[PDB]
Amino acid sequence: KVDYPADEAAMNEALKFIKNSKCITHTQICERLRVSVALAKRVMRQLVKSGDFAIVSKSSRMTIFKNMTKK
Amino acid sequence: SSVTRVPADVFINSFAAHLKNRGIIKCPAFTDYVKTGVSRQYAPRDADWFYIKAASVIRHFYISGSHSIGVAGLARKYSSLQKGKTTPHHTKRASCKVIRSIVSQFLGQKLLIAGERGRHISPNGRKMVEDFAEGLQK
């Protein structure tokens, strides 16, 4: 219902949580963690900047992201 | 060929970035506080919109050449629906002042030259478009 737009110390916990996945959409993070999609969007822009993820499809509405190896 | 052989967005985005650094166009503040047209409720949220719109204006002028479009007709390609009323939505038009200013800046740069009736793209402008498309032609 209510989400944090704004992760603080838990941004690394989120990074570990998103790295703890097989694939994800920024909307899937919004369901899995109580985060606005916009926060999740920005967070995953640098998740592929850290290079631990990859785009499968990119569309304006939705982009599917599969973590490169992360195994 | 060339500029039409290139996708529109990449060419419009790139040429726009070049205009700001080059000093071509130089946006007017009095027209930079306004919405593109009556059909827009909110004014552009893309920051330097004058530059990107100007890039597109010279991309249409290039294709037209013989047609010699005026300020109002080229504004029509930026027309949108007017929404938010109990009455059904109607397609309106973009603001001419933004486009008159853009054209006058291309005309002063001599990229555009006037014609009887509407203004058309001049060889200095024609080469600028041809060269930029040649810049990213793949």
């Binding site: - | 060929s1 039409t4 052989r5 996708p7 294709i63």
Partner: protein, 151 residues
């Protein structure tokens, strides 16, 4: 915009060996074909880029199906006028296919390719008879009518 005397006379000089017209929904795409660079040009732009992007495979449907052999060594100055988007994309594909059938010219492969063309998808060769409808009084639609108050 279609059914006009300027079909594709935009080309100045430029005599072309083969001509074909593919049409769908008030849209005429007329291609001027000559042996050229294996290049397909519609609306002055290359075949690779067209406006309905998820329909690009359709605009190039027999490039994969018939075989690039005929596609290599061919220049197509297609122009589409009329319709909206999908109407134009089905009409370019119809025009491109018929132009290549004419390009074989005398070997019976025009018959064999038409046999292949009717197999993967007919309409690559034949016209889509479905065209449009007429509004009639007593309804916003043609078939649809207005609401009855007292049954």
């Amino acid at each position: 915009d279609l059914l006009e005397r300027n079909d594709i006379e935009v080309r100045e000089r430029d005599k072309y060996t083969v001509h074909t017209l593919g049409k769908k929904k008030n849209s005429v795409a007329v291609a001027f074909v000559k042996a050229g660079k294996g290049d397909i040009l519609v609306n002055n732009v290359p075949l690779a880029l067209v406006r309905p992007e998820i329909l690009r495979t359709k605009v190039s449907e027999p490039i994969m199906i018939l075989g690039e052999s005929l596609f290599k060594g061919l220049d197509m100055n297609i122009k589409v006028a009329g319709g909206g988007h999908v109407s134009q994309i089905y009409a370019v594909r119809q025009a491109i296919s018929r132009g290549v059938l004419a390009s074989v010219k005398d070997e019976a492969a025009r018959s064999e390719l038409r046999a292949k063309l009717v197999s993967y998808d007919r309409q690559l060769v034949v016209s889509d008879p479905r065209r449009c409808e007429a509004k009639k009084f007593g309804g916003r639609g043609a078939r649809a009518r207005r609401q009855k108050s007292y049954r």
